[PDB]
Each structure stands twice: as C-alpha cells, then as structure tokens.
From a paper:
The Gs protein-coupled adenosine A2A receptor (A2AAR) represents an emerging drug target for cancer immunotherapy. Herein, we report two crystal structures of the A2AAR in complex with Etrumadenant, obtained with differently thermostabilized A2AAR constructs.
Next, we additionally obtained the crystal structure of Etrumadenant in complex with a modified A2A-StaR2-bRIL receptor construct in which the S2777.42A mutation had been reverted to wt (designated A2A-StaR2-bRIL-A277S), but which still harbored the T883.36A mutation in the binding pocket. Surprisingly, even though a major interaction partner of the ligand was mutated, the binding pockets of A2A-PSB2-bRIL-Etrumadenant and A2A-StaR2-bRIL-A277S-Etrumadenant are largely similar with only subtle differences. The same cyano moiety is planar in the T883.36A mutated structure, but is unable to form the same hydrogen bond interaction due to the mutation. Nevertheless, the structure of a modified A2A-StaR2-bRIL construct (that has the S2777.42A mutation reverted to the wt residue) in complex with Etrumadenant revealed nearly identical binding poses of Etrumadenant, despite the T883.36A mutation. However, we show that the affinity of Etrumadenant for the A2A-StaR2-bRIL crystallization construct is reduced by 47-fold compared to the wt A2AAR (Ki 39.8 nm vs. 0.851 nm) whereas the affinity to the employed optimized crystallization construct A2A-PSB2-bRIL is unaltered (Ki 1.12 nm).
Residue numbers in the entry: -1 to 208, 1001 to 1042, 1060 to 1106, 219 to 305
C-alpha cells in the first residue's frame, strides 16, 4: 500500500494540466467569436455556450474533483454541491451539442426559412433556458435524491469528522440509481441517440439534394439529345415539356440564367406546337449556350455549398462523438458498480483514468475547430500572432 499522496500527486498534477489547457483553448474560442463577425452566427453561439461549460470545468469542476478525491470532512449537502456541479456542466454541454445538430439540420432541410426561423435572439433565449435546465438536472440530488439521510458514520468517525459531517466522496453522497437511470440513461444516452438520429437525417438530406442536382443536370442534357435526334414535332414537344418542368424545379445572374432558359424552352415549345421541327430543334440548340454560361455555374455553386454543409456537419458530429468517447467510460463503470454488486469495484487506477479522460473532453474542441474550420484557424492565428 504505497503512500496515497504519491498517486494523488500524479492525479492532481494531471488534473491541473488539463484545467490549464481547457481554460486557454476555450477562452481562445470565445475570443475568436467575439472578434470575428464571420464567426457570429447562431451555430457559434451554442459553440460559445459549450466553450463556457468547458472553461468552468477547468475553473471549478476540476478543483472540485481534486477536493472530493481527498474524502475531506464536509457537511453532506455542501459535499453534494461540489460533487454535482460537474453534472450541470456536462448537461449544458449535451444541450449545446443537441442544439448545434438541430441548427445544422434546419439549415440543410429548409434553408429558405432558416434565417427567419433561427435568430440570434431566439438562440440566446434557448441557451438561457438550457442552462437553467442543466442546473435543475445536475443539482437534482440536492433536491433530496441523495444519500445524506444515510451517512457512512464509521467512515466519518474514522476521519475525525464533526457532527453532521461526512467524508466527502462522490459515490457516498450521489446515489448510483440517479447516476445510471436518471443521469446516464435519460439525460445523456437519450440525447446522444437523438443527436445521432439528427446527424443521420442531415447526411441523408445532403445525399438526396446532391442526387437531385445531378438528376436534374442529366435530365437537361438527356432531353437535349432527344430533341436533336427527334423526327417529328411531337417528340420535340415531349422533351421540351419535361425540360420546362425540370427547369422550374431547379430554380426553386442566377435569376437571369433561368429566365433565359425557361424563355428559350418556351420559344422552342411554341415552334414545336406549330409543327416546325427543324426550327424548334435549332431554337433548342440555343439552350446549350445558356447551359454553359449560366446553368452549370449554378449547379457547381449549389454542389459546393452542399459539400461545405456536409463538411461542417461532420465537424460538429466529431465534437459530439468525442464527447461520447470521453464520457462513456465513467458511465459504463457506474453501470458495473450499480448492476453488478457481485463484481469488484473498478480499481483505483482505472477510476482516475476515467475521471481524467472525461475532463480531457474540455480540451479537445478548440483543436477540432482549428483543424476543421478555416475561419476559426485563421482567427486563432491572428489572435496568437498579435
Ligand atoms: C461526474 C460524472 C459524470 C458527470 N457529469 C458522468 C458520469 C460519471 C461521473 C462520475 C464522477 C466521479 C468522480 C469522482 N471524482 C473525484 C475523485 C477523483 C479521484 C479519485 C476519487 C476516488 C479515489 C475514487 O474517490 N474520486 N470526480 N468525479 N465518480 C463517479 N462514480 N461518476
Ligand atoms: C462564482 C464562484 C466564485 C463561486 C465559487 C463558490 C464555491 C467555491 C463554494 C460555494 C459553496 C461552497 C461549499 C458550501 C459548503 C461546504 C460544506 C463545508 O462543510 C465544507 C466546504 C463546502 C463543501 C463549500 C466548498 C466551497 C464552495 C463550493
Ligand atoms: C452567483 C451567486 C448567486 C452564487 C451562487 C450561490 C451558490 C453557489 C450557493 C448559495 C447557497 C449555497 C447553499 C446554501 C446552503 C447549503 C447547506 C449547507 O449545509 C451546505 C452548503 C449549501 C448546500 C450551499 C451550497 C452552495 C450554494 C447553492
Ligand atoms: C467508450 C469505449 C471506449 C468503451 C469503454 C470500455 C470500458 C469503459 C470498459 C471495458 C472493459 C470494462 C471493465 C471490464 C471488467 C471489469 C471488472 C469489474 O469487477 C469492474 C468493472 C470492470 C473493471 C470494467 C470497467 C469498464 C471497462 C474498462
Ligand atoms: C450505444 C451504447 C454506447 C449504449 C451504452 C452501453 C451500456 C449501457 C452497456 C454496455 C455494456 C453493458 C454492461 C455489460 C456487463 C454488465 C455485467 C452485468 O453483471 C450487469 C450489467 C452490465 C454492467 C452491463 C450494463 C450495461 C452496459 C454498460
Ligand atoms: C466561464 C464563464 C463565462 C465565459 C465567457 C463566455 C461568454 C463571452 C464570449 C462572447 C462571445 O463570443 O459572444 C459573441 C456574441 O456577442 C456575438 O453576437
Ligand atoms: C425548470 C425548473 C428549474 C428549478 C428552479 C425552481 C425551483 C427549485 C427548488 C429549489 C429549492 C430546493 C433547495 C434546498 C433543499 O433542497 O434543501 C433540502 C434539505 O434542506 C431538506 O429540506
Ligand atoms: C440501454 C440499456 C441496456 C441495458 C441495461 C442494463 C441492465 C442490467 C441488469 C442486471 C442486474 C441483475 O439482474 O442482477 C441481479 C443479480 O443476479 C446480480 O446481483
Ligand atoms: C504542475 C502542477 C504542480 C503541482 C505540485 C504537486 C501536486 C500535489 C501535491 C500534494 C498532494 C496532496 C493531496 C491531498 C490529500 C490526498 C487524500 C488521498 O490520498 O485520498 C484518500 C481519500 O480517502 C480517497 O480514498
Ligand atoms: C479567484 C480566487 C481563488 C480561490 C481561492 C482559493 C483556492 C484554493 C482553495 C484552498 C482550500 C484549503 C482548505 C484548507 O486549508 O483546509 C484546512 C484543513 O482542512 C484543516 O481543517
Ligand atoms: C469565477 C470563479 C473564479 C475562481 C473561484 C474559486 C475556484 C475553486 C477553488 C477550490 C475549490 C475547492 C473548495 C473546497 C475546500 C474544502 C476544504 C475544507 O473545508 O476543509 C475544512 C474541513 O474539512 C471542514 O470541516
Ligand atoms: C452560469 C453561466 C454559464 C454560461 C454563460 C455563457 C453565455 C453563452 C454565450 C451565447 C450568447 C450569445 O452569443 O448572444 C447572441 C446575441 O445575443 C444574438 O443577438
Ligand atoms: C433501458 C433500461 C430498462 C431496464 C433496466 C434494468 C432494470 C432491472 C434490473 C435490476 O433489478 O437492477 C439491479 C439493481 O441495481 C440491484 O443490483
Ligand atoms: C427536471 C425538471 C424539468 C423542469 C420542467 C419544467 C419546464 C419549464 C420550462 C419550460 C420551457 C419553456 C420556455 C418558455 C419561456 C418563454 C418563451 C417565450 O416567451 O416565447
Ligand atoms: C487522459 C490523457 C491525459 C494523460 C493520461 C494520464 C493519466 C494518469 C492519471 C492516473 C494516475 C495514475 C495512478 C497511479 C497510482 O495509483 O499510484
Ligand atoms: C489547449 C491549448 C491551446 C492554447 C493555445 C495558446 C493560446 C492561448 C492564449 C489566449 O487564450 O489568448
Ligand atoms: C475565466 C473566464 C474568462 C472568459 C473568457 C471570455 C473572453 C471573450 C470575450 C470577453 C468579451 C470582451 C471583453 C473586452 C473586449 C475589448 C474589445 O472588444 O476590444
Ligand atoms: C483561475 C481560478 C482557478 C482556481 C484555483 C484553484 C486551484 C486549487 C486546486 C485544488 C483545491 C484542492 C483543495 C484540497 C482539499 C483539502 C484537503 C483536505 O482537507 O484533506
Ligand atoms: C426552464 C426555466 C425557464 C427560464 C426562462 C429563461 C428566460 C429566457 C426567455 C427567452 C426565450 C426566447 O427568447 O426564446
Ligand atoms: C439555478 C440558477 C440558474 C442558473 C443561471 C444561468 C442563467 C443564464 C445564463 C445564460 C447566458 C445567456
Ligand atoms: C435551479 C436548479 C435548482 C437546484 C438548486 C439547489 C440549491 C440547493 C440548496 C441546498 C441547501 C441545503 C440546506 C440543508 O439541508 O442544510
Ligand atoms: C452513442 C452515440 C454517439 C452520438 C454521436 C453523434 C454523431 C454521430 C455521427 C453520425
Ligand atoms: C489503457 C486503459 C485501460 C485498458 C483496458 C481496461 C480494462 C481494465 C480491466 C481491469 C480489471 C480490474 C480488476 O477487477 O481486477
Ligand atoms: Na463539455
């Protein structure tokens, strides 16, 4: 049994290193959003709320975790607060991650009404509401779902604790049925699964819209070929009518290009209906000039916008997946403790790895933004250089 202060020194030193990096990186995120108006959008207000939670992991939750690792004597309800505050920050993170996913889904699924639906003032209200709900969820043990009514008196007496005091240890004061059924299953697992469903819908919507763009492009070029090798006016008419409905479907300098295109289709359709096949086919050949000068530029720009949305949704999904990767080990350990009382408790070294891993999640987001979002990376460079 090596002196506890030795392994404690390693744990504390690692925690302090994580706290420093979590503060510095997420302050940099908040500084970047404040300074750059290209970063001031609803999506990034949730990013800032998420960075604020991670700053508070460094400033408060990590000091609280160090404190409660000592088992020091404390009034049980005071011990509850330092045990549970991190649950508020994790819950706020969950709400921010879910909001980011939903925001990106609205942007990809109804972009025409996004800006009118998703506003900065509405985002700020949602963030306020989510922080209040995070306090209610994370501090629910302080409302009475706690073990303060059944203190471990032998542990308190062995440490010289005063009257009404307990040895302040997370698993002695926070009930494990709360941690497993309420916190993990209901408040963490269900929102993460909802996030997964939203991201699946985002990527499926992007895939469908890109396919729809390519289908309309092929229909345009296919029907032009049909007109060229048509042998009567009715065949020309058939292909032009299919082109006209498709042109309006793709319309839902951009406006000018489609105005020319639909007009040139109408010109050829009128000639077709007069039985002037050769003249209609010549009129339809003009469509190619409009296709090259206008329509192809719209196709490429629409594709480029969708691909950027896919890239941004992947970046956001990486953040959500890394949250799950960092927090799941601690939750899984709690499940073993709760569901398997015949199993030996996870060993002390694994406890400290799982706790430290959950704290490292507050370090990682600034790096994801830097490596994946040019506007962040460039703003980070300007802040650091200056
Ligand atoms: C909070 C949380 C969330 C959230 N939010 C989500 C899932 C799980 C947990 C969580 C957290 C902690 C815990 C313990 N400590 C202090 C500490 C540090 C080092 C060593 C020790 C020992 C020696 C074991 O007493 N104790 N900090 N967090 N313990 C447990 N079972 N679950
Ligand atoms: C906005 C920031 C500065 C507020 C930070 C306040 C923190 C550090 C304060 C607020 C409430 C405090 C706790 C309230 C009660 C107790 C019970 C006592 O037996 C031991 C200390 C302990 C556990 C306190 C530790 C410090 C504490 C967590
Ligand atoms: C920004 C301002 C409002 C600071 C926020 C105040 C918070 C940190 C303070 C105010 C009231 C405090 C609680 C007041 C009463 C008790 C009961 C006591 O047995 C232990 C501490 C405990 C459980 C305190 C925990 C921390 C607490 C919730
Ligand atoms: C999210 C990804 C990384 C999966 C994480 C898997 C981790 C958390 C799993 C894998 C194997 C698991 C261990 C397997 C067996 C035991 C023995 C038991 O007496 C206590 C729990 C303990 C020690 C488990 C703790 C959790 C554990 C370490
Ligand atoms: C989609 C995924 C990440 C959902 C989370 C998986 C969790 C809920 C699963 C994965 C492995 C599971 C554990 C595997 C083994 C045991 C040992 C048994 O004696 C009691 C239940 C217990 C402790 C399980 C509890 C639930 C568990 C922790
Ligand atoms: C830890 C607690 C608080 C940390 C500071 C986080 C909040 C301050 C960051 C300011 C910001 O990025 O907002 C930009 C908007 O104003 C653009 O409209
Ligand atoms: C959404 C709702 C968010 C929650 C805010 C509103 C009300 C919360 C209740 C606050 C009151 C509860 C805090 C004090 C307490 O629990 O003491 C327990 C022991 O002293 C035994 O009494
Ligand atoms: C998502 C949720 C999936 C699974 C939930 C885990 C439930 C696991 C329940 C196992 C507890 C049990 O039956 O033990 C009884 C005694 O024999 C042992 O002491
Ligand atoms: C880079 C930063 C430099 C930092 C410099 C060194 C950091 C650590 C110093 C002293 C540790 C004292 C720890 C306080 C007491 C620990 C209690 C303990 O070991 O846990 C027992 C409890 O009962 C659970 O079972
Ligand atoms: C911004 C302001 C910074 C916050 C102030 C102090 C941080 C460190 C907290 C120090 C906690 C020491 C507790 C202590 O000395 O306990 C004595 C021992 O328990 C005998 O009973
Ligand atoms: C915006 C925020 C700026 C900074 C805010 C401050 C940062 C937190 C520092 C330490 C937390 C740990 C505090 C708990 C210390 C407990 C020691 C203690 O009370 O021991 C005496 C005896 O155990 C009782 O009977
Ligand atoms: C305990 C408090 C914790 C976090 C507060 C951090 C606040 C979160 C920052 C987002 C607010 C924001 O960006 O405001 C949008 C602006 O109001 C559009 O008009
Ligand atoms: C979703 C999960 C629903 C079912 C979750 C399993 C609830 C029944 C198992 C049970 O009795 O829980 C063991 C308790 O922790 C004593 O070990
Ligand atoms: C775990 C406890 C959960 C608390 C349940 C109670 C829910 C209270 C909050 C509900 C969200 C409603 C927000 C309404 C604010 C006003 C919005 C508006 O004026 O348009
Ligand atoms: C997580 C990645 C960051 C660094 C990982 C290192 C973690 C070390 C923390 C665990 C402390 C070792 C326990 C040794 C002991 O019990 O004596
Ligand atoms: C994680 C750590 C990345 C920190 C990058 C260093 C710059 C921080 C300075 C600042 O916040 O203004
Ligand atoms: C510990 C918590 C630290 C929070 C870090 C947040 C930093 C980001 C924005 C703060 C707002 C800006 C304050 C001064 C602005 C000066 C200026 O605009 O030139
Ligand atoms: C920028 C603000 C950051 C706050 C700095 C706080 C850093 C201090 C870290 C941990 C405090 C640990 C308290 C130890 C508990 C007492 C031990 C005992 O009584 O046995
Ligand atoms: C849940 C508890 C409710 C708290 C009310 C928070 C105040 C936010 C109102 C603004 C709502 C909005 O504009 O969308
Ligand atoms: C419990 C007390 C409520 C918590 C207070 C947090 C409220 C608002 C932060 C929103 C930032 C905009
Ligand atoms: C909004 C979120 C609601 C949660 C707030 C909890 C505050 C807890 C106050 C606990 C005081 C305990 C008094 C005692 O029993 O000694
Ligand atoms: C446990 C589910 C983890 C949730 C991550 C969400 C992102 C997945 C991307 C597709
Ligand atoms: C590297 C991080 C740890 C790797 C794998 C986790 C598995 C640890 C299982 C040890 C069982 C503890 C025991 O009950 O004896
Ligand atoms: Na977080």
């Amino acid at each position: 049994g090596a002196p506890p202060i030795m392994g404690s020194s390693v744990y504390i030193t690692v925690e302090l290193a994580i706290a420093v990096l979590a503060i510095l990186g997420n302050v940099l995120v908040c500084w970047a959003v404040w300074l750059n108006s290209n970063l001031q959008n609803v999506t990034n207000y949730f990013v800032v709320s998420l960075a604020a939670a991670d700053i508070l992991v460094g400033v408060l939750a990590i000091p609280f975790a160090i404190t409660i690792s000592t088992g020091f004597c404390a009034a049980c309800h005071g011990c509850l607060f330092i045990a549970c505050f991190v649950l508020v920050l994790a819950q706020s993170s969950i709400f921010s991650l879910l909001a980011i996913a939903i925001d990106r889904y609205i942007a990809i699924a109804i972009p025409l009404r996004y800006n009118g639906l998703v506003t900065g003032t509405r985002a700020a209200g949602i963030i306020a509401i989510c922080w209040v709900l995070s306090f209610a969820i994370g501090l629910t043990p302080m409302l009475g779902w706690n073990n303060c009514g059944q203190p471990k008196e032998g542990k308190a007496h062995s440490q010289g604790c005063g009257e009404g005091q307990v040895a302040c240890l997370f698993e002695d004061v926070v009930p494990m049925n709360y941690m497993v059924y309420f916190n993990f299953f209901a408040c963490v697992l269900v929102p993460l699964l909802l996030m997964l469903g939203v991201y699946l819908r985002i990527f499926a919507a992007a895939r469908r819209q890109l396919a729809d763009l390519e289908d309309n492009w092929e229909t345009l070029n296919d029907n032009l070929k049909v007109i060229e090798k048509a042998d009567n006016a009715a065949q020309v008419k058939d292909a032009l009518t299919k082109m006209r409905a498709a042109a309006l479907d793709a319309q839902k300098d951009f406006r000018h290009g489609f105005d020319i295109l639909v007009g040139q289709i109408d010109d050829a359709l009128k000639l077709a209906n007069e039985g002037k096949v050769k003249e209609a086919q010549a009129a339809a050949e003009q469509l190619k000039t409009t296709r090259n000068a206008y329509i192809q530029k719209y196709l490429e720009r629409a594709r480029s916008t969708l691909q950027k949305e896919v890239h941004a949704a992947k970046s956001a999904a990486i953040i959500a997946g890394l949250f799950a990767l960092c927090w799941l080990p601690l939750h899984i350990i709690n499940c073993f403790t709760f569901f398997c009382p015949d199993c030996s408790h996870a060993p002390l070294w694994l406890m400290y790895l799982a706790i430290v891993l959950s704290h490292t999640n507050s370090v990682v987001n600034p790096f994801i933004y830097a490596y994946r979002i040019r506007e962040f990376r460039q703003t980070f460079r300007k802040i650091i250089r200056s």
